[PDB]
């Protein structure tokens, strides 16, 4: 009826719930603390052993740009529901103005849009079990947090029409970007959060998670993860791509920078592989029924590789 | 039978002749409905779903399951009748007519006992013969539905369930929801494979499996105002209609589905022919027909659009997002105008948004509208609606550095996922649009100065989402000579309409070149030189009727060595 | 025909006498309309066009095509009637008169089957007569439009579409948008050359 997953735990579901940490690691490379906290919250919720009043989970995520804060929420939604589009995603970037917050819960009676209702409350009532993502919470004004203040503790919101909605079974996730060696960054992020938000809001949350910066192993596995998308896209046109390990090493070498996250790597892949392969496809050099072995020549595998190029077969 | 037939249609006899379409993949929801009707008290389910998912198709499949015989004993040999409220209300000039008709229907149902009632569009019951607070269909059905003596099945969309039923909590209590979720892609493929036969017989055409896989994928990927499996059926049906018209046995492939989608939404997903392929490969020259110099920017944009047209673009992100940052007048806007001219054939199709106006803290709502409860709620956003008019577009954000950070905090949405939620609450698609951000800042060392200025005037994330940051180079002598050539060609082309012919010697072009070069150039100067020394002179000369219509005008120069500064040179208009 | 002549106007009979202006250069849109009208389910096109562009001109061109017989076999000898919703709900004074008139119109169309409806200002279907005890014409028409048993053609302003039809997704689903864009300069010259004889 309601879609809230209270059942008897079958053996397959049980061994999945024990093993869902590495299931989250299938889409996220690194960030052991965030995956740990999410796994603890889901295990508490699905065991039937949970606080009735408080929501299922309340997390604020902090770290540099592109360290998978939104990717973690997307993979969690993919785990629980099977697809990313079931994630209730509200981005706070549109809520900079104080008058904009009426979109969240709805128009009061006697005003335009009262019959339409809110956006967050209605989508929560549609699927009571959902992962609600609030992106870039600092970019909204501080008065917007006042509506979420009571759902963060009591799990109830009163819309304009007067109905009380249930936030008790949802997982609330906040994603931030403040703060931008690991312990110094954690202390700076915690201090910035304390001086940015009122302390009465930081106390009602479960865990404050700081995302660790990406290292060489993380980015060199993430090369494989983000090239699997291109391989699957190529599979739709009856042609396959296989990268030589030298290509993986060169892509990981030219896409690594501690200042930023994963998107420099996607820029490197997009400029080195996707564009050149697009030229080769539209020139009809390579078509369906062939394989593409991408290799790096004029390189040793250790140097910076300022003259190496990619060969397509 | 005679009473219900004039006021309703029997789906059982409809499925006896196969007049209903076969329904497949709906075993879970149909079992849910059959198990709700087997209850003792309050055995009335209402099918809540998003409009275009198969809420009536579930009921048709249940009618087929009844007539075949897969039902349990509680739904065995039950004639499923839909009820037409319009037939009840019509012809009732008086109170007695409508209430007598409804109670005669109820008496026939309770007398025969093997008719399950079906109320399509259940939200129509709140007010049938009178208002919500008087004697109508709802207040007659409610005592019957409370005890479960009347088996009825409802169907209401999500929004109308929120609006009409939920304000009447008495009917909301008596109906147990059955959610019909939107089918998946593989589910839609199976549904199309099931509905192959009817469309094949109707359109006299044969459909391939790859056509249906492509139809499902394209309908899910691009069309974002309708819901599966209706849009896939729409594409297949429209392709069959196109073949039926064109032949007057045809075959439907994924190419025809792509044509139907291109007609529907304008998204340029097509099987490329040779001419457009060579156009795409050589389009750098096509852009260089208009823009002169700046090879890096045209190269990057050519790469992005070639990636988009070959089906190698990340489907969760736009076609390309660029920051055009460089000195004024170089052609940062002209590149976007050239893109619009290339992609659409006309330049007015470039949706241009100027960031000069967005310098206040109250003007951020112009892009995506006003929140509910405020003025401007019905009109909504200006940018979002413009994008909804044509999903394939080039969006120009002119003069970025004028607008301050709230708009960019709004635009991180589109730069990441290509989504934007306007004030009305609807989400719009940006997965195909090309985003261009033109900036005037920092004015090889210019590269680093522009990078430092953009890092100082922006937060790291906004610069991070952008695909390529492109820094325009300053112009040189050959480039401004070609610019002079282009401007004179424009003047001649404009003058063609007034029965004229215009030509310049190369000495005049060189003289224009020598008086139009400095580090603060662009085309904002050296076009003022044109308007001051060629256009104005031509206008004043043709106003007093010399070298008028039909006469070729030749612009020459005298008193000039061809190498000197030419401050004493004057243009002669023969 | 005895009931539709009281509430509608026959464009095919109007094209018999040539009272409609010739339509020049709108062959693509007429082809798109005949393409949509040739479908099995949801064969209702709406001409989503800005005012002043010729939304009614497309329909009169389709009627002239029908009477001249260049249409495919699925539109051969089909009388295109415009539906005047004002006359449908004109004399009601009651709760059951308007719905009875709608039932008579739909029953005559079903028992004839060769009449295609045209609705100027298609957004008028929602709230097409809504008293305390009345059901508007949209709720009557929706089951017939979804199954494809009734072929209706709509003409609606972009803004009017967004204000009214966009608010009702159930009726929005049944209609396929047909983009009618502004003619270019040369197209306008061709239209003027077509209309030279009439204006002279
Ligand atoms: N650890 C990771 N594994 C895989 N992809 C990642 C990872 N970190 C970042 N990404 C990429 O970054 C994008 C998400 O970044 P996001 O978490 O939204 O950063 P921010 O929240 O700071 O904007 C995704 O498209 C994903 O491809
Ligand atoms: N499982 C299925 N098998 C066959 N056809 C289907 C299936 N699901 C949906 N359809 C098609 O999609 C349409 C769904 O209409 P429906 O969603 O009931 O309209 P509404 O939302 O207005 O009630 C039907 O016309 C039907 O032909
Ligand atoms: N290389 C060029 N080719 C053609 N036209 C140009 C070129 N450079 C500049 N122009 C013209 O001059 C104008 C300069 O625009 P732009 O460079 O965007 O100014 P700003 O940099 O101050 O925004 C353009 O509108 C264009 O018409
Ligand atoms: N292709 C065309 N050929 C001839 N006349 C046309 C054409 N397109 C538009 N028109 C003229 O435009 C007018 C139609 O405007 P109309 O569609 O009624 O605007 P609205 O629907 O907003 O009232 C007619 O008078 C018609 O003569």
Numbering used by the authors:
A (entry chain D): 491 to 670, 689 to 821
B (entry chain C): 168 to 415, 476 to 670, 691 to 821
C (entry chain B): 168 to 367
Task: Tell me what the authors wrote about this structure, in their words.
The unfoldase ClpC1 is one of the most exciting drug targets against tuberculosis. These ATPases activate the Clp proteases but also bind protein substrates, unfold them, and translocate them into the proteolytic compartment.
To further stabilize the sample, considering that ATP is being continuously degraded even at low temperatures and that some AAA+ proteins have been shown to hydrolyze ATP analogs, we introduced two additional mutations in the double walker B motif (E288A and E626A). We hypothesized that these mutations allow nucleotide binding but prevent hydrolysis and therefore further stabilize the hexameric assembly. Processing of the data resulted in a structure for apo ClpC1 determined to a resolution of 3.6 Å (see Experimental procedures). As expected, the overall structure of apo MtbClpC1E288A/F444A/E626A consists of a hexamer composed of six ClpC1 subunits (A–F), with the D1 and D2 domains arranged in a ring that together forms a pore through which the substrate can be actively translocated. In line with recent structures, including the recent cryo-EM structure of B. subtilis ClpC, the observed ClpC1 hexamer is not symmetric, as observed originally in the crystal structure of ClpC, and instead adopts an asymmetric spiral structure. An important characteristic of our structure is the observation of a 23-residue long peptide visible in its central pore. The presence of substrates in the pore formed by D1 and D2 has been previously reported for other members of the family, but as no substrate has been added to our cryo-EM sample preparation, it was probably taken up and trapped inside of the inactive protein during purification. Finally, the NTD and its adjacent 26 residue linker are not visible in our apo ClpC1 structure.
